[PDB]
């Protein structure tokens, strides 16, 4: 019941590297030992681009060509919150302990996201936008 | 203001197919050309369903309880209709031509007479949701040799017998384990067995054939089975049966003969009650109730319906419409009146809700062409090709004075001043605008200046100057007052017809031969702006057309134009399938309307199906009238090139889809157009679609829905019970957060009941705010239903505004009194 799978990240559970995250528009945390899909969160409509685990509870799912990051709660099985870039999310990196997230945008933009799991508040806009532009313009 | 939906079709009271009453004798089901009309006899109202069929209807029934309506075409299109809800549930296609659908008296399963096949299907469930394939064929009985023409159940569901044009009349059961109980056939007649029946006791069998014969079959001895105990012949000499019914609980035969005669009998006795000459024209369908005290005939030679009592010599309705001959249509200033003229001469007077010709005037001898109302809808006139304009009033319903010319000349169109002296008529022959006084029958003025016919005329509602349309492509505006007798031409460049003025009378809509409607100034001479119709008109290609509709010049103009009651919209209609709603100042059409979607109507289809285009000829243009079983239907009287002539059969063609007359209602912006099919009504009276709620109940069911949080449905289950303890339970049970959510979703059926419950209970109640939110939410919810029917809520609303002023506004006046004393005593000062 995963016929298309193009993104993968394994969890930092310790020495136990079981229950990793596979995704293509739909994500499954799946055990290595019991060979079963354990948790199934709906991903995005597009094929997924970025699949990053931040913390022990939260991981970012990213869509290709879409402007919406989704921060999913691991054990709760729901979205903790959403981030939304100014344009299509082209690349993703995150800090050590869910402090601030770097979004490389497809238009050419850098959106930073500051305390993404802080306290409606569920729609999280871009905090800072770091563009780069030449001397002449 | 834009959204107009189909409300009701009027007239053309029978074309083809079976007629039936409901469970109650109120509801009568008749086919129209492709639709089903329902006429409620005691509660005198009429109705026609929102949908149409694709060909002419040849089979019809409704449910036992009145829940499902089956209409079946000539071809075998079957349409499942929520009869109580007026919405279509399923389009099934039976691939054979069927003649009889009859539900069970159980209501559990219906059956169908298609070919030599009987098909017995389970009923689909109404309270269940609509499925892809709801229909389940229970059984199929094919023991017959020719086409099965008639069919009945027993009064028990467990016995069904059908009869064919083959000699046989055969009984079976629903269930095969009840096969061995009775499964046999009847024979021994002479001819088409046209109706075979069970008696009310399930022991006597009546079998009636085309030749004029009945056998009384009975399971009797010389094991032993099923002899004829007697025969019965009415001895119709050359006349033969067309249609036959049998009401069993009073043992009554209704017969329909080819000579238009009809007989009644008492079947263990076979005694002639009475013979009625229904006319020259044969009874094409008979019908009885379960009470069996009304009879229903339809002559498809004329197109008439007739409900008449057998016991008392008394009709209920003798309705006789005229196809292709709906020439004029007229809204009164009152929105309760409608006038239809004809080529036969009959000018009928309709109510919009209760669709009945309340009046008629059968005093014109020829075609009546144009009808306008004047002076608050009192007087109503009728110009004709009968050579006259005959006046009519709506109180005495009489002719006032037949205004005549000199040389007895036909009159094309009619225009009436609101100041009720001036009536102008334009002629198709004489092309001189004759002005008649209403008080004096002399002509006031013979306005001359039309080279070729005067098409159409209208006065302003404001300056009452008239605008006539030549066929010399030229408007002539006449200002006949102030003792000038002055004229002005407006040159158009192409051939105008169907003139129509704004109510302001400073702008005019014109339809040229190009289809282009132009708007003309009247205070000035130039053209204001022109809206195009040759692009956005649905036209049809006939089966005998030899050119495609994209470059057909058949119907891409407009035979009637009307301004809206702001003057800001226009509905136009022509010889096409398309009715159009242009905005006046924005100059672009809002919505395009089909009048009718019928294959037997000629110019309906845009693209013809190439499987019917054979080697030489159409597949339908072959004369198929020569294969009828009946001599009269095999007789061809069609004169070759008759276009919109006298009768239907004499075109030697299909009827063209054409719409003659177009008008707006003043009030609710509803527009009615008299089509080829008849008068159609579009309106903005939305949610008059009747909607039954929560159809099968305990008090526990509503209270469990309170526990189930199904609070609007619990209010319905309470209001079907009508015990005020339950209404005060369910009333104070819902929270405030879904009060206007509930009240907007309340039907109009319990609307006087809920308004009276609020209007009575809130007078003695401490929950003044809570009751007030209900009246706020209801009056903001469905105040429009109280806008139309004011006398329906007049007892409830009286109690409501008793509670508002004496009970609530007294508390409010106490509040504002203490408030204003506070404002005074804290805003002012003291002394010493």
């Amino acid at each position: 019941n995963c016929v298309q799978l193009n993104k993968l990240t394994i969890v930092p559970a310790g020495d136990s590297v079981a229950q990793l995250l596979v995704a293509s528009h739909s994500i499954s945390l799946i055990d290595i030992e019991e060979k079963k899909v354990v948790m199934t969160f709906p991903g995005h409509v597009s094929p997924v681009s970025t699949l990053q685990v931040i913390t022990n509870e939260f991981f970012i799912s990213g869509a290709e060509g879409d402007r919406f990051l989704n921060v999913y709660d691991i054990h709760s099985g729901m979205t903790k919150c959403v981030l939304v870039a100014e344009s299509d999310i082209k690349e993703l990196s995150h800090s050590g302990q869910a402090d601030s997230i770097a979004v490389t945008t497809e238009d050419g933009s850098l959106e930073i996201f500051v305390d993404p799991l802080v306290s409606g508040n569920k729609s999280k806009k871009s905090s800072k936008k770091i563009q780069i532009v030449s001397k002449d313009g | 203001k834009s959204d107009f939906k189909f409300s009701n079709l009027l007239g053309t009271v029978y074309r083809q197919g079976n007629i039936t009453f409901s469970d109650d004798g109120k509801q009568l089901l008749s086919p129209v050309g492709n639709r089903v009309s329902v006429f409620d006899l005691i509660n005198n109202k009429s109705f026609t369903f929102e949908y149409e069929h694709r060909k002419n209807i040849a089979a019809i029934d409704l449910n036992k309880q009145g829940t499902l309506l089956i209409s079946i075409d000539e071809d075998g299109r079957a349409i499942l209709v929520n009869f109580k809800a007026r919405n279509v549930l399923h389009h099934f296609n039976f691939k054979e031509k069927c003649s009889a659908v009859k539900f069970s008296p159980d209501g559990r399963l219906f059956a169908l007479a298609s070919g030599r096949f009987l098909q017995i299907w389970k009923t689909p469930d109404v309270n269940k949701d609509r499925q892809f394939a709801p229909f389940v064929r229970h059984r199929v009985h094919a023991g017959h040799f020719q086409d099965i023409t008639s069919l009945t159940w027993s009064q028990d569901s467990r016995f069904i017998l059908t009869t064919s044009k083959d000699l046989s009349a055969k009984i079976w059961s629903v269930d095969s384990e009840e096969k061995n109980l009775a499964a046999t056939t009847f024979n021994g007649h002479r001819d088409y067995v046209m109706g075979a029946f069970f008696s009310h006791d399930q022991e006597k069998i009546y079998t009636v054939s085309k030749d004029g014969a009945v056998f009384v079959w009975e399971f009797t001895k010389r094991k032993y089975s099923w002899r004829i105990t007697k025969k019965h012949f009415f001895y119709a000499n050359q006349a033969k049966v067309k249609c036959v019914t049998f009401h069993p609980a009073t043992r009554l035969l209704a017969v329909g003969f080819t000579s238009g005669e009809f007989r009644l009998y008492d079947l263990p006795d076979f005694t002639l009650i009475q013979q009625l000459s229904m006319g020259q024209n044969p009874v094409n369908t008979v019908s009885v109730n379960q009470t069996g005290e009304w009879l229903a005939f339809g002559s498809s030679k004329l197109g008439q319906l007739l409900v008449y009592e057998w016991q008392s010599e008394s009709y209920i309705l003798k309705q006789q419409g005229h196809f292709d001959s709906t020439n004029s249509l007229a809204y009164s200033p009152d929105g309760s009146r409608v006038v239809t003229a004809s080529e036969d001469g009959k000018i009928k007077v309709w109510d919009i809700t209760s669709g009945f010709c309340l009046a008629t005037f059968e005093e014109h001898t020829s075609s009546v062409t144009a009808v306008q109302f004047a002076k608050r809808g009192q007087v109503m006139f009728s110009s004709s090709l009968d050579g006259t304009v005959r006046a009519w009033d709506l109180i005495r319903y009489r002719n006032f004075r037949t205004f005549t010319g000199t040389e007895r000349i036909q009159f094309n169109c009619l225009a009436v001043d609101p100041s009720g002296e001036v009536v102008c008529a334009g002629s198709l022959d004489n092309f001189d605008i004759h002005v008649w006084s209403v008080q004096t029958g002399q002509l006031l003025d013979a306005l001359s200046g039309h080279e070729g016919p005067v098409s159409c005329l209208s006065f302003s509602q404001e300056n009452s100057v008239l605008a006539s349309a030549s066929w010399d492509k030229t408007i002539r505006i006449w200002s006949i007052f102030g003792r000038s007798q002055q004229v002005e031409p407006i040159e158009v460049y192409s051939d105008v017809l169907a003139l129509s003025m704004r109510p302001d009378g400073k702008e005019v809509a014109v339809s040229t031969l190009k289809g282009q409607i132009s708007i003309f100034n009247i205070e000035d001479a130039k053209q204001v702006g022109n809206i195009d119709c040759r692009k956005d008109i649905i036209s049809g290609r006939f089966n005998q057309d030899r050119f495609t509709a994209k470059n057909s010049e058949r119907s891409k103009f407009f035979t009637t134009i009307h301004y809206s009651f702001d003057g800001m919209a226009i509905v136009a209609g022509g010889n096409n399938n398309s009715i159009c709603l242009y905005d006046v100042p924005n100059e672009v059409l809002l919505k395009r309307f089909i009048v009718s979607r019928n294959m037997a109507l000629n110019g309906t289809l845009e693209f013809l199906n190439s499987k019917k285009m054979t080697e030489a000829g159409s597949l339908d243009l072959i004369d198929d009238a020569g294969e009828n079983s009946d001599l009269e239907d095999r007789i061809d009287n069609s004169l070759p090139g008759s276009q919109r002539g006298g009768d239907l059969s004499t075109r030697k063609m299909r009827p063209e889809v054409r719409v003659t007359s177009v008008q707006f209602s003043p009030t609710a912006n509803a527009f009615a157009a008299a089509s080829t099919e008849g008068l159609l009504i579009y309106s903005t009276n939305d949610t008059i679609l009747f909607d039954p709620f929560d159809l099968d109940v305990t008090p526990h069911s509503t209270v469990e829905a309170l526990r189930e949080k199904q609070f609007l449905n619990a209010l319905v289950m309470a209001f079907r019970l009508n015990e005020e303890y339950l209404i005060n339970k369910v009333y104070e049970a819902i929270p405030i957060k879904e009060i206007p959510l509930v009240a907007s979703n309340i039907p109009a059926i319990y609307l006087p009941r809920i308004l009276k419950f609020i209007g009575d209970f809130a007078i003695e109640s401490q929950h003044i705010e809570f009751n007030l939110i209900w009246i706020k939410a209801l009056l903001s919810a469905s105040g429009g239903y109280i806008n139309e029917h004011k006398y329906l809520f007049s007892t409830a609303m009286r109690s409501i505004q008793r509670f508002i002023v004496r009970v609530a506004k007294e508390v409010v006046n106490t509040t504002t009194d203490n408030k204003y004393t506070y404002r005074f005593l804290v805003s002012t000062d003291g002394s010493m």
Partner: protein
């Protein structure tokens, strides 16, 4: 998960999925039974008209399909359906928890294999009976006997002998007994496909190598072999028409045709089905006819024929290659964007990542036709820009269609992937029309809509420019510049007067269309992802990044409603036919339904799949969802047009005997109530242990004890009760009793009575407070009186409103 407003009707737009379909005969003629997930379909073969569908969605996906004459046997997870006419007549639930792999029908038996390498046997209850219902036994295949069960077939003239083939070898059983009557030796290759033969004793096997083996059982010998270079075989079939011909279907999409007498291939069909979706999934010659029905995993089902042979003298040598016959196709990929095409709910446009349109017909499943992508010969004369290897148009993100002037010019505008323009199509000609419509500021088309007069197509760039092209000559009219971000949804009003646009800047711009002026500019908070307009009622809705749909009035030039309530990116959303509702679906796997006059989510459907596109029909009947998996279009019946349902705000919580009833005193504390009993007490009053209890309520600063006997005090005694108030300097009992009244209005019950007591204070001590006006002790308590008092103008706002509406509604 259940919806109240809508319900599933069918998934429109599916032909097959790849599960090996079955063939059956009625008399002389043929039907075809294919699978679509949890729902199977039946076809005539001579027209590919749809005959039946499943009466129910199965709870899990169908794994196997067999078909005898009137009875089609479906096989999902543990249970096997015996269906007559697509209706569940008998469910046969197998006595394992193993999943049903394969199935076969012969004799009085049914035989179905599971993935525990064990086959179950189901006898008829009698040979007089027609469908098998008696459970006979379970036999198994242990790993000395065979491998994983690839198929069960019954070769003819084999009395109760069951032929179970594995990846390894072939077994034969007496299923009356249960005894293995023969085991074949292993074939050294991995056997992948079985097929019986119109010759005796022969089973054809296509392995994981390109090898087909004809195998006897009376010999037990592999009589002939057939090679294929480097292709994995999927299906085998035999043309039983009159020349011995063999069908080899790869999983590479290719169909290979052999004549075993000439020992030669006849023609190999290439790419009749998509390789990535399973290749050729199942191809089968119709028995005794020169017609082979092929089925792919690309939602497609084709027919091919051998033409009769041109060689009069030879016949069998000269063979016409197979030739395309009728086919029902679907979207191979799931559909990206759908819309309702016509006004009468007949046609739906569906575009996918398969890079094609499809014009489905919800009336009849066979009028569903794929649109053409064939360019008109360019009206300029200089030749067009594209690869000569003509690829399909890139997948579509937006759709736009008005049927006002259909077939006189183009009326379908489609915003393809990453193209600076957007092509136009005739809906009537089922073909892309002559004009393509650019952005003219070198950005991508990200949203389009057309004019209701059929003369204008509106095209919104990623850099903000909105071009108005004409559908007459492909000419532009005006190029509006308002947004500097991307446009993301455009519309025109129904009169073609005032046009709106929503952008990725957070701007909704109000322009006139006849005129050329920017009328209004509403600034919303998040950037605005989409725009849906309701022409009949002149509203327009928008999804934004604030997870919430704002419905904006175009007349009053402001928000009328905002529905907060979703949890994720709102994918698609749609008005009702009449503007009463909006159906929304988001990435939260919710499809919520909204009553916009109030603004509450009156039902939300929880789905297993994420709903990508929702589309309310222009008729009041149908709702179309497309999911992220699944290629069809789920059609939903709208029950509101049939009876009704409840409308509650019940979503976030998931996501009698005596026939009498005493009244509730106070429903919620916020509402105001009166005194139980007579209402006439106000008319009376307006026309010591007491002061001790008032003190003992004052020392609490809660006076709830006083109000009880204050209601219950006789009305003439109050004319001395307030006329003895003991206040000359301290004004305590004045302020004690006034704060008693203001605490009385706090619980809102007996609301009128504390006003009557206030006016009775004015009858008693208005001078005692008035000559000592400005005194900050009583002025504080009367300020407290006003603060408690100022809420209850909401019934004066109710009484005056409701009164005027009542008069205005009765008179007019």
């Amino acid at each position: 998960k259940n919806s109240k407003i809508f319900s599933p009707f069918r998934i429109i737009g599916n032909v097959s999925n790849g599960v090996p379909f079955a063939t059956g005969t009625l008399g002389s003629t043929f039907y075809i039974v294919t699978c679509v997930g949890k729902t199977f379909q039946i076809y005539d073969a001579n027209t590919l008209h749809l005959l039946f569908v499943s009466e129910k969605e199965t709870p899990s996906s169908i794994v196997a399909l067999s078909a005898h004459f009137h009875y089609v046997y479906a096989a999902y997870e543990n249970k096997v359906g015996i269906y007559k006419r697509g209706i569940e007549e008998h469910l046969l639930e197998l006595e394992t928890d193993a999943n049903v792999e394969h199935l076969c029908i012969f004799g009085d038996y049914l035989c179905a294999s599971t993935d525990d390498n064990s086959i179950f046997i189901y006898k008829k209850s009698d040979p007089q009976d027609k469908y098998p219902s008696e459970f006979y036994t379970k036999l198994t295949v242990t790993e000395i006997q065979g491998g994983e069960i690839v198929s069960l077939q019954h070769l003819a003239t084999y009395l109760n002998k069951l032929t179970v083939v594995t990846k390894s070898n072939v077994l034969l059983f007496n299923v009356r007994t249960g005894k293995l009557v023969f085991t074949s030796n292993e074939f050294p290759d991995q056997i992948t496909t079985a097929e019986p033969a119109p010759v005796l004793d022969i089973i054809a096997l296509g392995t994981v190598t390109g090898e087909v083996i004809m195998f006897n059982m009376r010999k037990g010998k592999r009589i002939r072999t057939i090679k294929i270079p480097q292709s994995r075989i999927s299906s085998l079939s035999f043309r039983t028409d009159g020349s011995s011909h063999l069908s080899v279907g790869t999983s590479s999409g290719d169909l290979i045709f052999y004549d075993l007498d000439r020992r030669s291939r006849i023609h190999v069909l290439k790419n009749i089905h998509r390789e990535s979706y399973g290749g050729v999934t199942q191809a089968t010659f119709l028995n005794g006819q020169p017609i082979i029905v092929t089925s792919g995993g690309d939602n497609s089902l084709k027919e091919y024929v051998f033409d009769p042979s041109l060689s009069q003298g030879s016949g069998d040598v000269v063979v016409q290659p197979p030739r395309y016959l009728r086919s029902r196709g679907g979207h191979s990929q799931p559909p990206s964007y759908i819309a309702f095409a016509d006004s009468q709910s007949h046609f739906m446009l569906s575009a996918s990542k398969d890079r094609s349109l499809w014009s489905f017909s919800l009336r009849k499943d066979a009028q569903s036709q794929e649109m053409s992508q064939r360019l008109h010969k360019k009206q300029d004369g200089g030749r067009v820009g594209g690869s000569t290897i003509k690829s399909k148009f890139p997948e579509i993100v937006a759709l736009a269609i008005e049927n006002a002037r259909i077939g006189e010019w183009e009326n379908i505008i489609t915003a393809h992937k990453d193209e600076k323009f957007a092509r136009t199509w005739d809906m009537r000609n089922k073909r892309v029309g002559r004009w393509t419509f650019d952005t003219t500021d070198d950005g991508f088309v990200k949203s389009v809509a057309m004019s209701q007069c059929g003369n204008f197509g509106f095209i919104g760039s990623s850099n903000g420019s909105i071009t108005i092209y004409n559908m007459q000559s492909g000419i532009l009219r005006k190029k509006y510049k308002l947004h500097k971000r991307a446009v993301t949804g455009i519309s025109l009003d129904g009169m073609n007067r005032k046009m709106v646009s929503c952008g990725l800047d957070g701007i909704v711009g109000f322009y006139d269309f006849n005129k050329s002026t920017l009328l209004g500019k509403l600034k919303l908070d998040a950037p605005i992802t989409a725009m849906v307009y309701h022409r009949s009622s002149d509203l327009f809705a928008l999804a934004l990044d604030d997870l919430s749909i704002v419905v904006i009035d175009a007349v009053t030039q402001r928000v009328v409603r905002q529905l907060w309530g979703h949890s994720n990116r709102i994918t698609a959303f749609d008005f009702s036919p009449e503007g009463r509702w909006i159906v929304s679906a988001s990435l939260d796997s919710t499809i919520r339904t909204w009553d916009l006059p109030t603004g509450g989510c009156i039902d939300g459907i929880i789905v297993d799949n994420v709903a990508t596109n929702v589309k309310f029909s222009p008729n009041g009947d149908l709702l179309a969802t497309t999911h992220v998996t699944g290629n069809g279009i789920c059609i939903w019946t709208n029950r509101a047009q049939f009876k009704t349902v409840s409308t509650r705000t019940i979503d976030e919580s998931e996501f009698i005997d005596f026939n009498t009833y005493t009244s509730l005193e106070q429903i919620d504390k916020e509402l105001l109530t009166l005194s139980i009993g007579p209402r006439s007490k106000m008319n009376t009053l307006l026309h010591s242990h007491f002061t001790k209890q008032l003190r003992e309520g004052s020392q609490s600063k809660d006076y709830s004890s006083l109000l009880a006997t204050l209601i219950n005090f006789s009305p003439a005694a109050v004319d001395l009760e307030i006329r003895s108030l003991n206040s000359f300097e301290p004004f305590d009992e004045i302020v004690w009793f006034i704060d008693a009244l203001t605490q009385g209005l706090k619980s809102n019950k007996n609301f009128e009575l504390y006003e009557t007591f206030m006016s009775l204070l004015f009858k008693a001590h208005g001078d005692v407070i008035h000559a000592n006006n400005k005194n900050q002790d009583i002025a504080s308590a009367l300020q407290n009186w006003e603060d408690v008092h100022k809420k209850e103008d909401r019934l004066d706002d109710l009484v005056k409103f409701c009164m005027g509406v009542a008069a205005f509604v009765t008179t007019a």
